[PDB]
């Protein structure tokens, strides 16, 4: 009722084999494109699904074994032999970057519209892809710390200012998936090890601060020993000109007793509406209000395992991909969210917070 739930595309319907519909081969940097690396008789290829053009599919052979699209532009990044990276504008045919890293890339993701992020066995790096220095290697941000040892790296996120960063690894510990995050402040050149499976940097407009957002970091964890889930929201880098500060928030994330090996797989936030969308691997969607941390809604949108996710619809929602190749989207209903909070949550104060932030009806 308080959300719209839709299917963006069925990847099996486009002829993609199940062996490629997983974290190894399918990437989702934004709601604009899905990229599937495929292989056939020794030859690699890319299927680029353009969600902004009726799920139009571009199919091309390539020499690399990993490929991602830019969040908005027709710019493809391709990798071979671990270390060799080339980045091309598909429209102009221009080569934007061509370099070899010192160590194999084991994870990458666009951090912003300008900057591509890389994680190796021991290092975390970024590339200013559009600066025109075609052969310049990625710059070292920081060495990986011991807390990410023996993990599979599954995310790398940054704030828009590109001075706060988080790298997420998971490991299996006593038959449960534990999450480890290296949080890095570029300004202080210091890292901090925290427990968490998911992370994002976002912004919130608080009363008193005019049109200037404050920055918050949102992270979700599931304690591998107790099973207890926890969402936390905390401010970073407060501009002293702004009188209103974000007060730290902590909320429970509920996991049923029989979802033993489940954990948070993704978190996206609507800045405009102040809504946190948290998805689990088993396909449970959780909504929280950003200002207060209040739990709004919990449901299950799929019984198939989710492996990746991205912002949806001008970053006001979340889209995800499951192992059956279904690309699913959730966003709040702008007409029904305030009535739901008012009538179903019986929370007049929260209803007003949401209505006022979003310019929404119902209050």
């Amino acid at each position: 009722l308080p959300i719209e739930f839709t299917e963006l595309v069925d990847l099996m319907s486009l002829g993609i084999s199940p062996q490629f519909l997983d974290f190894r081969s399918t990437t989702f940097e934004s709601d604009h494109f899905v990229t599937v690396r495929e292989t056939k008789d020794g030859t690699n290829s890319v299927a680029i699904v353009d969600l902004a053009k009726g799920n139009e599919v571009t199919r091309k052979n390539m020499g690399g074994d990993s490929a991602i699209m830019h969040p908005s532009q027709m710019v493809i990044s391709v990798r071979a032999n671990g270390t060799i990276v080339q980045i091309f504008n598909l429209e102009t045919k221009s080569k934007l970057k061509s370099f070899t890293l010192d160590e194999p890339v084991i994870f990458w993701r666009w951090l912003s519209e300008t900057t591509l992020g890389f994680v190796t066995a021991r290092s975390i790096l970024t590339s200013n892809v559009f600066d025109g220095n075609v052969n310049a290697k990625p710059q070292l941000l920081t060495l990986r710390h011991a807390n990410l040892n023996n993990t599979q790296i599954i995310n790398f996120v940054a704030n828009k200012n590109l001075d706060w960063f988080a790298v997420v690894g998971i490991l299996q510990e006593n038959g449960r998936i534990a999450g480890r995050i290296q949080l890095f402040s570029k300004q202080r050149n210091i890292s901090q090890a925290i427990d968490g499976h998911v992370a994002i940097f976002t912004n919130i407009l608080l009363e008193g601060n005019g049109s200037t957002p404050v920055q918050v970091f949102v992270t979700g964890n599931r304690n591998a020993t107790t099973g207890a889930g926890e969402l936390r929201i905390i401010e970073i880098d407060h501009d002293a000109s702004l009188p209103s500060q974000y007060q730290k928030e902590t909320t429970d994330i509920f996991f049923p007793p029989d979802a033993t090996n489940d954990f948070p797989i993704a978190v996206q936030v609507s800045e405009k509406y102040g809504i946190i969308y948290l998805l689990t691997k088993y396909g449970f969607i959780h909504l929280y209000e950003l200002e207060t941390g209040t739990n709004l809604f919990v449901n299950r949108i799929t019984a198939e395992s989710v492996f990746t996710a991205a912002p949806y619809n001008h970053e006001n929602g979340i889209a995800c991909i499951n192992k059956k190749g279904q690309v699913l989207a959730v966003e709040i209903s702008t007409s029904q969210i305030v009535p739901y909070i008012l009538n179903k949550l019986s929370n007049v104060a929260l209803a007003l917070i949401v209505a006022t932030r979003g310019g929404l009806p119902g209050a």
């Binding site: 210091i190 901090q192 970091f217 905390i234 970073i236 730290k248």
Partner: peptide, 5 residues
């Protein structure tokens, strides 16, 4: 520490 987490 960097942050209260």
């Amino acid at each position: 520490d960097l942050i209260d987490l």
